[PDB]
Amino acid sequence: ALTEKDLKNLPEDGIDSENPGKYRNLLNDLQGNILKGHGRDHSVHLFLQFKPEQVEVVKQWIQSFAQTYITSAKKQADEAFKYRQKGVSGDVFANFFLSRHGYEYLEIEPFQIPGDKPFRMGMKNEEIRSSLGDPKIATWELGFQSEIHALVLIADDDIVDLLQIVNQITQKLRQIAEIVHREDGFILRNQAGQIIEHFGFVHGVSQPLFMKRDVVRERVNNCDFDKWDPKAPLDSILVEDPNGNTKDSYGSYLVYRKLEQNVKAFREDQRKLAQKLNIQENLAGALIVGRFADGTPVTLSDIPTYAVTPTNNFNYDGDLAATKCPFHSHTRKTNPRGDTARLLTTDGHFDEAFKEERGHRITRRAVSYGENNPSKEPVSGSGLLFLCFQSNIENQFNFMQSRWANPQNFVQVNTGPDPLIGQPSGTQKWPKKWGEPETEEYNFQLWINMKGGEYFFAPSISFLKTLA
Amino acid sequence: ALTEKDLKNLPEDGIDSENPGKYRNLLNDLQGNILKGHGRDHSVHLFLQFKPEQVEVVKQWIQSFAQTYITSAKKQADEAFKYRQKGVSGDVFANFFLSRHGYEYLEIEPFQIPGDKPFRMGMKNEEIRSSLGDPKIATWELGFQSEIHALVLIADDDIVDLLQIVNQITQKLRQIAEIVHREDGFILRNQAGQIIEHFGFVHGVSQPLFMKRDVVRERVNNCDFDKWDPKAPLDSILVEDPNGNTKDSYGSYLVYRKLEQNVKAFREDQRKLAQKLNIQENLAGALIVGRFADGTPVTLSDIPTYAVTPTNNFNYDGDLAATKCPFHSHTRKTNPRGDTARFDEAFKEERGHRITRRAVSYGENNPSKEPVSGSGLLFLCFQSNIENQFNFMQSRWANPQNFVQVNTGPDPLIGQPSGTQKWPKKWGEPETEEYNFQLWINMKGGEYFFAPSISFLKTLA
Amino acid sequence: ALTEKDLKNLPEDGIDSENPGKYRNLLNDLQGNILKGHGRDHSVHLFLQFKPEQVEVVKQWIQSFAQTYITSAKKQADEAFKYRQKGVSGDVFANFFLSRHGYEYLEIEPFQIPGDKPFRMGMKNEEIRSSLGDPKIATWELGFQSEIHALVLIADDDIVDLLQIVNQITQKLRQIAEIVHREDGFILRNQAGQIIEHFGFVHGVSQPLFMKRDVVRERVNNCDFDKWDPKAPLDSILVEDPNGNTKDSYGSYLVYRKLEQNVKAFREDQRKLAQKLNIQENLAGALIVGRFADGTPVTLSDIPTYAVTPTNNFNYDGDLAATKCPFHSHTRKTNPRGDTARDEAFKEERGHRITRRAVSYGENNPSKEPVSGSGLLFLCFQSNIENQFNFMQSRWANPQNFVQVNTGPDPLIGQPSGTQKWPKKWGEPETEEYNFQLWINMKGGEYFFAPSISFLKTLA
Amino acid sequence: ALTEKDLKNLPEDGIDSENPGKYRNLLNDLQGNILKGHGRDHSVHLFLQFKPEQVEVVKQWIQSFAQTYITSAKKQADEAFKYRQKGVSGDVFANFFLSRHGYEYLEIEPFQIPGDKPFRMGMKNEEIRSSLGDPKIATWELGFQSEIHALVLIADDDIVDLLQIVNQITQKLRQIAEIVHREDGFILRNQAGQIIEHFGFVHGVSQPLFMKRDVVRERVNNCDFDKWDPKAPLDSILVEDPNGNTKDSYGSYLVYRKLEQNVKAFREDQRKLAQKLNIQENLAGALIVGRFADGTPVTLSDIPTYAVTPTNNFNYDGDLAATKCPFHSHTRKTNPRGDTARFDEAFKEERGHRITRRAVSYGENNPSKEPVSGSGLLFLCFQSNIENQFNFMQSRWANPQNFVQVNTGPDPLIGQPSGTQKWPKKWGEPETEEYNFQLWINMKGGEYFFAPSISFLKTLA
Ligand code: HEM
Ligand code: HEM
Ligand code: HEM
Ligand code: HEM
């Protein structure tokens, strides 16, 4: 019975998984890892292509997997609650995702396939590739060149147990599917214990928030959200599953991209940038990313502050000319925190324009691959397994990459591409002295390579359980 | 060339140790641990009485110690910078302090001895004892009953190495001095990794800030400064060293007090208070201290809320009647945040009484245990004027029953003598009930010292 | 050159990898993990079926794998030496094995396929199954019911890294092969840090030894060799690779069996046995296995004694009537230490030994009691499967009359189960009958050959 | 009752601390750390000189320390038992030792002072120094140049708590004694978790054994002692305390020596030796010490075996020509395992020279580093006769060039003065080459003490 209103407006404290009220049925039929990350230290990603002419036994397998393993949002919350209260660790965590091709394999009518246009086109689609600035599909890792039908995600803190359970699951799975690709994701940490990505920066700091446990935690640590509200409405991440079987059956769209990071070359380019500007290497890093390695926002400081829990309580209102945090910095390109509402609004509707800007946000659930020692500097074979959720790929991930990160004239003319993820690489203007207007041009090179991926839908659990 | 102006007004971002500008010479000749704490996990405190008739060899020893070991504020900042940037751990940290009696031992002329009156009088002085409400000197631990000339402080994160270095240092030291007392300080922590004191409360939260690294961290991570500005001027902590060699030779006055904490009895009294008011035990704690054990200010909340960086950008403007945080609570007694001004001139004066705390713990290192005796706080603080700062805070704020208002009662944590407080029955409502919270902290000994400029110590012989 | 003499007689200190003498060329072309275990904490086992009509590209893949990853015995020894001397870890460990079906897929002429008869027949063969007392092939786990061509084994101490490297390897591999089954092996330990198996017993103690580093360690730290000599000749494990590129090209035959252990039921049966005999649970365990859980040989003691290096320099000469260690106990069945010879007969008895390279699967917490899904990935090497593993199972463990009439089957591994006679009091003759049940289930496996490296490097 | 027989013959399984039988009174009145090491990870050593004319208050202090802190052998065993059985940690461990000078300070009559001649002479005695090959007393560290009366030893696994307890103990102690020197001992370990000394070799492997727990553990791990019996009779370590309160009152003589180890130079010398002989560096180490770094005996192997618990089950009967383990190697010099008997009576006499080691490390705690000075071994050992045990071992075995055979040369590790050894070119073959391995251990000070019975100390005042 959830209305338009209920989906467009998050409660003030978020959705309370212990007292869900009208969101109870939703949480029971929605898969986990969407509204709140599964939080497990290890994961396995199995990309599947179902075997020809085996539709009925495939459906039986999916059904059994949904009955036995898939974790709902309610189950995810209950497992976290039982762990905190009684030290009892829960079952493995599991998600199941379908591509558009997967829906076709399953003989679901076109009109019943999730409607998102990028999801239907697929990440190999030439128009999609062109719009993202992505490389040719022939450059992708072999696993991703196959037609992918589905993704199985299994996660757990105990790696050896995770491997055993995966090996059990795969016995029946292999009868009906080719496993065309596998990843074993993990969480990289720095010596302070912060979660980082391979270039050494704390990662996952700024997220749309939905669940009470997150909202309340973030509020107490971010000054009552007095500079930035991280809450987001449910309709920025959920969509009705057109084939769900409850009054409140929802899913979300997944973007999966394997992003290789050339750490050695990145560090060299960062040092060179620092030498050219005659600044500290750590500040050069902060100008590229928008934060110091520890998470300190460069809009707020020209030095790292080393807080283990970095602040998210800022906007760029004290930095309108972007002489502290440049317009090109990754954080400011991907989350303008109002820049588009000021700079690109001429009818004066700041509030409406800011709401629209905020509607482009993505909910990240990324993990690392490759080298697990963060002191090392891999050239290839290490990076980020980029996963994010949204209700509209065209308006969220694709928008963020194609309209914000890539273009040289966003948010203002001659900003240049995002030096971390913008394709193609180009020219940025860097402040010589933090907080002062004079800049110098430097072409920071793109040290991230797209190695493959796909768009999926996370269906409602009831859909999956009644497929056979 | 630092002027009156430079000393009375801190720069907006504090003193930048990596780009010190006009403060460069000051930072080279000022000892560390004053403007910013040494931050090491372990320390050794050696209290000295120099041996009679050995003035010249004592001076030679002090000179060698200053040349080899003493850490300047600049060196301290450089060691932290090298550690962050390259993982290289620095030398051991060291301070050296002299008492007035120590200056006299060294045959320094009276006009050249630091001028602070409490420092000159000494912590054993009867007037000082009476003013502080302190116990009789005959009750102090034996080590502190000796005439103390100096204090050597050595600190390091690696405890075993620290002990070896100390044992090396003490070989030549014992030739020229009696070590009359030793402490081995350490940092107590809660399960979240926050620094606490033996009663279980997060500790060292609210400080005067001077250095850029501290000022910016606080501003960025603790919600800016619009309710409470933690910056302080240099003249609230530094004093020109009358015997320094440089144009910018400064020191500071140290108060050292060994404060024994009866954890078992404190917890019992806290439970009895809670049960008398029919409130949660954690809230009873918060009414005694002014914060919950997790650091949550009781003026802002009647429950703990677990902020990772405990809140400090607040004042009592939403709590004028003190029915959330009582006037008697330790934090509100020791930092009234404008109560005395209730303006601008009066608040500046009020803020001039602040102290810069550099305390460490002694005794039991397992924070789950409940020692009765032999555990507590090695209370160290710095200031430019002991009469106006530590002594003022203890004698005029914490102890009196009529500060800040009539019948407030003494600070139930540190006030001497103990007395009667009025406790709100319901947080945020006016009705109170009287309860005599007992004093569970005992003064076991201490002394006042001066941290001299490094150049003074390096050219003493 | 290696002569018959060199293969039939191990040097007194074993083969010295750092000064190999006449064995130098052999160690260069022989895969690791055979003469000495790879010693890595984690492993991944990938069972392969090559895709139809892709023989040439399969050969190219195998060749690249042999050039890039396969660890020789010389490389294995060098990696251990560099690790001890300089702390440098070095590469992942890798083996590659072929089944007879794999040889046929690769269009290798029959006269060139390794000659061992069980190997050629395959572990699914009905005569093999019957001989071993094995269950029907339809009861096997699904992965093992496919026709298996090859096994890729990759191992490393750093599990996360191992997983990344495996995922890299499998990208090109999947183009030319189905991965029909996977295991992730790991090492179970007790609180003292000794390697154990799921029933709780220290495991991997008694082995044929070949390399100096093993021989000397064992001699120095395990009380010399005067009661039991653990050395074995190279011809008890190595076989000439008919397709190697020199006369010094050797391989070995691998037996792989997934053996599920019902820990819960085993412990109950052990407790019931102990109650029936009115003895301590731990002694009942020792009578089943031949050792206490801590490794203490039950022939030597009726109590555990916690030796750090579990004892292996013993025989049953003080226990001829088997009233301390019964004739049915697992250790005494699988290694009679002279019972069958009661000189030439003892040498023959010792020729049946197997070199074990097993690892665990399933539950990694050894305090738990899984019913199914946990056990031992049993791997062993030999030069002659008929005379070694198959002999040990079919002629020693299984039969009721080995080593003497009415001994009964090995209560741990004997198939089918039956009746054992158990001493009421250790060291005294009176026994009582009890049918210990079989709590190990064969879930699948295959026989393979580990070829010489030069064969694999020049296959395309 | 204890008879001559009981003291000259250890029971087959050693003394059972849980069931002591005839040894019950002995274990109550005997200090710990003698028959079995205290096994604590940290210790503090306080060397004392009692203050002139304060004999009676010194006696009262010693009495209170014996009543409150000193650990008997029985208490030590009970604390270990409770810890294993219930996880309950015990009190700190403590010993108290007196020098001959300390006995004289306490006005104990000469006939009542322990009779051992080296003990009475003192380690500063010129004839003692000459006999040991020791350096001039003026080269010792300053702390050891004082007249030392006593040594207080306090030990615990929890370093911070140990420090606090020591600081408490020293308050009353300082009233009646000068603390002339302090060490903070610790246990150095290699990456495998084995206890090592600074040169990197596993240390403490071969010991005389007395207590059942040790005897049984060692027996099971050493092949039922079939090559070497490590047991020793009680009279090789215990001495009747002439001033104990019963006939079951015993003590032992302590040798304490601070031995500095030049790790950097030792490693260079080892590498030079290896290059000259064209052998592996690890084997060169084994030829110096008698064992590889991991403990593997070089008499048994020319390669390390890396067993975490090294074997002790060997003698040199497979190596009579000493071409595997040279006659000069430290282990073979200090424990010939029958070389001097080459029988039964001579081997018994040879075994009577053994010492029971209770050493700990000082200085650098990171074993990967290579200190030149300031790091080493705090060498402690016990015996019933210093002349026949430690002094005999150093002066008659380690030092002489003609022990055990002509032109063996000094022990290259500890022999003073240094000289020439003959090293086998190829392990197990006779041809040798001369190389002068240098002495990289420096004696920095020490003293001989007696560990008195507890009853003596408890009734001293
Ligand atoms: C290997 C590739 C990438 C790296 C290393 C990376 C790194 C980071 C870092 C260090 C942060 C700052 C801390 C945080 O809030 O998490 C961040 C934030 C973020 N990144 Fe990325 N990023 C990557 C790819 C992407 C891509 C492809 C997108 C979207 C198209 C994206 C969108 C975001 C967003 C939305 C934020 C949060 C901005 C905010 O709310 O302040 N990132 N990224
Ligand atoms: C064992 C004795 C003491 C204990 C257990 C103790 C405990 C605490 C605690 C828990 C806080 C709150 C957190 C913080 O800001 O650090 C605090 C604050 C403080 N204490 Fe103490 N204290 C002790 C002695 C003293 C003494 C003797 C003084 C001065 C005479 C003092 C002055 C202060 C001041 C100035 C603050 C900061 C108040 C603010 O700015 O809000 N304390 N103390
Ligand atoms: C899950 C199945 C099995 C378990 C739990 C198991 C367990 C053990 C145990 C605890 C030992 C004693 C310690 C040792 O020397 O390793 C051992 C020894 C041994 N086992 Fe097994 N075993 C299993 C299967 C097999 C099979 C199938 C064979 C051969 C057909 C075998 C052959 C041996 C041999 C040869 C020894 C060494 C005996 C000796 O030399 O004293 N085991 N086994
Ligand atoms: C810094 C000085 C010394 C070092 C580094 C050192 C090192 C060692 C090492 C590595 C061992 C072999 C393992 C073991 O403990 O059994 C050992 C054994 C021994 N050392 Fe020392 N040692 C030192 C000084 C001394 C001195 C001064 C003596 C006697 C005068 C001595 C007597 C012994 C004895 C008796 C053994 C055992 C011999 C045996 O029973 O096999 N050591 N030493």
Side-chain angles (χ1 to χ4, degrees), chain B residues 197-199 201-207 228 257 259 261 289 291 312 314 316 330-331 334-335 337 355 357 376-377 379 390 393-394 398 413-414 441:
Chain B
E197 52 69 43
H198 277 282
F199 297 147
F201 294 78
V202 303
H203 196 228
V205 179
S206 183
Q207 298 265 41
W228 173 258
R257 292 165 68 77
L259 301 183
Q261 296 173 259
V289 171
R291 294 172 183 269
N312 211 43
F314 68 96
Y316 298 118
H330 182 61
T331 56
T334 57
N335 184 0
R337 303 188 186 229
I355 56 168
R357 292 178 291 141
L377 191 74
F379 178 88
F390 169 81
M393 188 175 283
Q394 182 79 54
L413 193 66
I414 64 162
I441 294 169

Coordinates of all heavy atoms in Angstrom, one line a residue, chain B residues 197-199 201-207 228 257 259 261 289 291 312 314 316 330-331 334-335 337 355 357 376-377 379 390 393-394 398 413-414 441, ligand 2:
Chain B
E197 N 39.8 8.4 31.4 CA 40.5 8.4 32.7 C 39.8 7.3 33.5 O 38.9 6.6 33.1 CB 40.3 9.8 33.4 CG 38.8 10.3 33.4 CD 38.0 9.5 34.4 OE1 38.4 9.2 35.5 OE2 36.9 9.1 34.0
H198 N 40.4 7.0 34.7 CA 40.0 5.7 35.4 C 38.6 5.6 35.8 O 38.1 4.4 35.9 CB 40.9 5.6 36.7 CG 42.2 5.1 36.5 ND1 42.4 3.7 36.4 CD2 43.4 5.6 36.5 CE1 43.7 3.5 36.2 NE2 44.3 4.6 36.3
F199 N 37.8 6.6 36.0 CA 36.4 6.5 36.2 C 35.6 6.1 35.0 O 34.4 5.8 35.0 CB 35.8 7.8 36.8 CG 36.3 8.1 38.2 CD1 36.5 9.5 38.6 CD2 36.7 7.2 39.1 CE1 37.0 9.8 39.8 CE2 37.1 7.5 40.4 CZ 37.3 8.8 40.7
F201 N 35.5 7.9 31.9 CA 35.0 8.9 31.0 C 36.1 9.3 30.0 O 37.2 9.5 30.3 CB 34.6 10.2 31.8 CG 33.4 10.0 32.7 CD1 33.6 9.3 33.9 CD2 32.2 10.4 32.4 CE1 32.4 9.0 34.7 CE2 31.1 10.2 33.2 CZ 31.2 9.5 34.4
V202 N 35.6 9.5 28.7 CA 36.6 10.1 27.7 C 37.2 11.4 28.2 O 36.5 12.2 28.9 CB 35.9 10.3 26.3 CG1 35.4 9.0 25.8 CG2 34.8 11.2 26.4
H203 N 38.5 11.6 28.0 CA 39.2 12.6 28.8 C 40.2 13.3 27.9 O 40.8 12.7 27.0 CB 40.0 12.0 29.9 CG 40.5 12.9 31.0 ND1 41.8 12.9 31.5 CD2 39.9 14.0 31.6 CE1 42.0 13.8 32.3 NE2 40.8 14.5 32.4
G204 N 40.4 14.6 28.0 CA 41.3 15.4 27.2 C 40.5 16.0 26.0 O 41.1 16.4 25.0
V205 N 39.2 16.1 26.1 CA 38.4 16.6 25.0 C 38.6 18.1 24.8 O 38.9 18.6 23.7 CB 36.8 16.3 25.2 CG1 36.0 16.9 24.1 CG2 36.6 14.8 25.4
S206 N 38.2 18.9 25.8 CA 38.2 20.4 25.7 C 39.5 21.1 26.1 O 39.8 21.0 27.3 CB 37.0 21.0 26.5 OG 36.9 22.3 26.2
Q207 N 40.2 21.6 25.1 CA 41.5 22.2 25.3 C 41.7 23.5 24.6 O 41.2 23.7 23.5 CB 42.6 21.3 24.7 CG 42.7 19.9 25.3 CD 43.7 19.9 26.5 OE1 43.8 20.8 27.3 NE2 44.5 18.8 26.5
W228 N 31.6 27.6 20.5 CA 32.8 27.7 21.4 C 34.0 27.7 20.5 O 34.3 26.8 19.8 CB 32.9 26.5 22.3 CG 34.1 26.4 23.1 CD1 35.2 25.6 22.9 CD2 34.5 27.2 24.2 NE1 36.2 25.9 23.8 CE2 35.8 26.9 24.6 CE3 33.8 28.2 24.9 CZ2 36.4 27.5 25.7 CZ3 34.4 28.8 26.0 CH2 35.7 28.4 26.4
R257 N 50.4 17.2 39.7 CA 49.7 16.7 40.9 C 49.3 15.3 40.6 O 48.7 14.9 39.6 CB 48.4 17.5 41.1 CG 48.7 19.0 41.6 CD 47.5 19.9 41.5 NE 46.4 19.6 42.4 CZ 46.4 19.9 43.7 NH1 47.4 20.5 44.3 NH2 45.3 19.6 44.4
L259 N 47.0 12.5 41.5 CA 45.6 12.5 41.9 C 45.1 11.1 41.9 O 44.7 10.5 40.9 CB 44.7 13.4 41.1 CG 45.1 14.9 41.0 CD1 44.2 15.7 40.2 CD2 45.3 15.5 42.4
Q261 N 42.6 8.1 42.4 CA 41.1 7.9 42.1 C 40.6 6.6 42.6 O 41.0 5.5 42.3 CB 40.9 7.9 40.6 CG 41.2 9.3 39.9 CD 41.1 9.2 38.4 OE1 42.1 9.0 37.7 NE2 39.8 9.2 37.9
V289 N 30.0 14.6 36.0 CA 31.1 15.1 35.2 C 30.8 16.3 34.2 O 31.6 17.1 34.0 CB 31.7 13.9 34.3 CG1 32.7 14.4 33.3 CG2 32.3 12.9 35.3
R291 N 29.6 15.3 31.2 CA 29.5 14.5 30.0 C 29.2 13.1 30.4 O 29.7 12.6 31.5 CB 30.8 14.5 29.2 CG 31.2 15.8 28.6 CD 32.6 15.7 28.0 NE 33.1 17.0 27.4 CZ 32.9 17.4 26.2 NH1 32.4 16.6 25.3 NH2 33.4 18.5 25.8
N312 N 32.5 19.4 21.1 CA 33.0 20.5 21.9 C 32.5 21.9 21.4 O 32.7 22.8 22.1 CB 34.5 20.5 22.0 CG 34.9 21.1 23.4 OD1 34.3 20.9 24.4 ND2 35.9 22.0 23.3
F314 N 29.8 23.8 21.6 CA 28.6 24.0 22.3 C 28.9 25.0 23.4 O 30.0 25.2 23.9 CB 28.0 22.8 23.0 CG 28.8 22.2 24.2 CD1 28.5 22.6 25.5 CD2 29.8 21.4 23.9 CE1 29.3 22.1 26.5 CE2 30.5 20.8 25.0 CZ 30.3 21.2 26.3
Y316 N 26.4 26.9 27.0 CA 25.3 26.7 27.9 C 24.1 27.6 27.7 O 23.2 27.8 28.5 CB 25.8 26.7 29.4 CG 26.8 25.6 29.7 CD1 28.1 26.0 30.1 CD2 26.5 24.3 29.6 CE1 29.1 25.0 30.3 CE2 27.5 23.3 29.9 CZ 28.8 23.7 30.2 OH 29.7 22.6 30.5
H330 N 31.4 19.0 36.7 CA 32.9 19.3 36.5 C 33.1 20.2 35.3 O 33.9 21.1 35.4 CB 33.7 18.0 36.5 CG 35.1 18.2 36.3 ND1 35.9 18.8 37.2 CD2 36.0 17.7 35.4 CE1 37.2 18.8 36.8 NE2 37.2 18.1 35.7
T331 N 32.5 19.9 34.2 CA 32.8 20.7 33.0 C 32.3 22.1 33.1 O 32.9 23.0 32.6 CB 32.3 20.0 31.7 OG1 30.8 19.8 31.8 CG2 32.9 18.7 31.3
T334 N 34.6 24.1 35.6 CA 36.0 24.3 35.2 C 36.0 25.2 33.9 O 37.0 25.8 33.6 CB 36.8 23.1 35.0 OG1 36.1 22.2 34.1 CG2 37.0 22.3 36.3
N335 N 34.9 25.1 33.2 CA 34.7 25.9 32.0 C 33.2 26.4 31.9 O 32.4 25.8 31.4 CB 35.1 25.2 30.7 CG 34.9 26.2 29.5 OD1 34.6 27.3 29.7 ND2 35.3 25.7 28.3
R337 N 31.9 28.6 30.2 CA 31.5 29.0 28.8 C 30.5 30.2 28.8 O 29.6 30.2 28.0 CB 30.9 27.8 28.0 CG 31.8 26.6 28.0 CD 31.2 25.4 27.1 NE 32.2 24.3 27.2 CZ 32.7 23.6 26.2 NH1 32.3 23.8 24.9 NH2 33.6 22.6 26.5
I355 N 43.3 26.3 31.3 CA 44.5 25.6 31.4 C 44.7 24.6 30.3 O 43.7 24.1 29.7 CB 44.6 24.8 32.8 CG1 43.4 23.8 32.9 CG2 44.6 25.7 34.0 CD1 43.5 22.8 34.0
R357 N 45.9 21.0 29.4 CA 46.1 19.8 30.1 C 47.0 18.8 29.3 O 46.8 18.6 28.1 CB 44.7 19.2 30.5 CG 43.9 20.0 31.5 CD 42.6 19.4 31.8 NE 41.7 19.6 30.6 CZ 40.8 18.7 30.2 NH1 40.6 17.6 30.9 NH2 40.1 18.9 29.1
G376 N 45.3 6.3 39.4 CA 44.7 7.6 39.2 C 45.3 8.4 38.0 O 45.7 7.8 37.0
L377 N 45.3 9.7 38.2 CA 45.7 10.6 37.1 C 47.0 11.4 37.6 O 47.0 12.0 38.6 CB 44.6 11.6 36.9 CG 44.8 12.5 35.6 CD1 44.5 11.7 34.4 CD2 43.9 13.7 35.7
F379 N 48.2 14.5 36.9 CA 47.6 15.7 36.3 C 48.8 16.7 36.0 O 49.5 17.1 36.9 CB 46.7 16.3 37.4 CG 46.1 17.6 36.9 CD1 44.9 17.6 36.2 CD2 46.7 18.8 37.2 CE1 44.4 18.8 35.7 CE2 46.1 20.0 36.8 CZ 44.9 20.0 36.1
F390 N 45.5 27.5 36.8 CA 45.2 26.3 37.7 C 44.7 26.7 39.1 O 43.7 26.2 39.6 CB 46.3 25.3 37.8 CG 46.1 24.3 38.9 CD1 45.2 23.2 38.6 CD2 46.6 24.5 40.1 CE1 45.0 22.3 39.6 CE2 46.3 23.6 41.1 CZ 45.5 22.5 40.8
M393 N 41.2 28.2 39.0 CA 40.2 27.2 38.7 C 39.9 26.3 39.8 O 38.7 26.1 40.1 CB 40.7 26.4 37.4 CG 39.7 25.5 36.8 SD 40.4 24.7 35.3 CE 40.3 26.0 34.2
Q394 N 40.9 25.8 40.6 CA 40.6 25.0 41.7 C 40.0 25.7 42.9 O 39.0 25.3 43.4 CB 41.9 24.3 42.2 CG 41.8 23.3 43.3 CD 41.2 22.0 42.9 OE1 41.8 21.3 41.9 NE2 40.2 21.5 43.5
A398 N 36.1 25.4 41.2 CA 35.8 24.1 41.7 C 35.4 24.0 43.2 O 34.4 23.4 43.5 CB 36.9 23.1 41.3
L413 N 33.4 16.1 41.6 CA 34.6 15.3 41.1 C 35.9 15.7 41.8 O 36.5 14.9 42.4 CB 34.7 15.4 39.6 CG 35.6 14.4 38.9 CD1 35.1 13.0 39.0 CD2 35.8 14.8 37.4
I414 N 36.2 17.0 41.8 CA 37.5 17.5 42.3 C 37.4 18.6 43.4 O 38.4 19.0 43.9 CB 38.4 18.1 41.2 CG1 37.8 19.4 40.6 CG2 38.6 17.1 40.1 CD1 38.7 20.3 39.8
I441 N 38.8 11.6 44.8 CA 40.1 11.9 44.4 C 40.9 12.5 45.5 O 40.5 13.3 46.3 CB 39.9 12.9 43.2 CG1 39.2 12.3 42.0 CG2 41.3 13.5 42.8 CD1 38.8 13.2 40.9
Ligands
HEM2 C1 41.5 12.8 38.6 C2 41.1 14.0 38.5 C3 40.2 14.4 37.4 C4 39.4 13.7 36.5 C5 39.0 12.3 36.7 C6 38.9 14.7 35.6 C7 38.0 14.4 34.5 C8 37.6 15.2 33.5 C9 36.6 14.8 32.5 C10 36.0 13.5 32.3 C11 36.5 15.9 31.7 C12 35.6 16.0 30.5 C13 36.3 15.7 29.2 C14 37.4 16.7 28.8 O1 37.1 17.8 28.3 O2 38.5 16.3 29.1 C15 37.3 17.0 32.2 C16 37.4 18.2 31.7 C17 38.1 19.2 32.3 N1 38.8 19.2 33.5 FE1 39.0 17.6 34.7 N2 39.4 15.9 35.8 C18 40.2 15.8 36.8 C19 40.9 16.9 37.4 C20 40.9 18.2 37.0 C21 41.5 19.3 37.7 C22 42.4 19.2 39.0 C23 41.3 20.4 36.9 C24 41.7 21.8 37.2 C25 41.8 22.3 38.4 C26 40.5 20.0 35.8 C27 40.1 20.8 34.8 C28 39.4 20.4 33.7 C29 39.0 21.3 32.6 C30 39.4 22.7 32.4 C31 38.3 20.6 31.7 C32 37.6 21.1 30.4 C33 36.2 21.6 30.7 C34 35.7 22.2 29.4 O3 36.4 23.0 28.7 O4 34.6 21.9 29.0 N3 40.3 18.6 35.9 N4 37.9 16.5 33.4

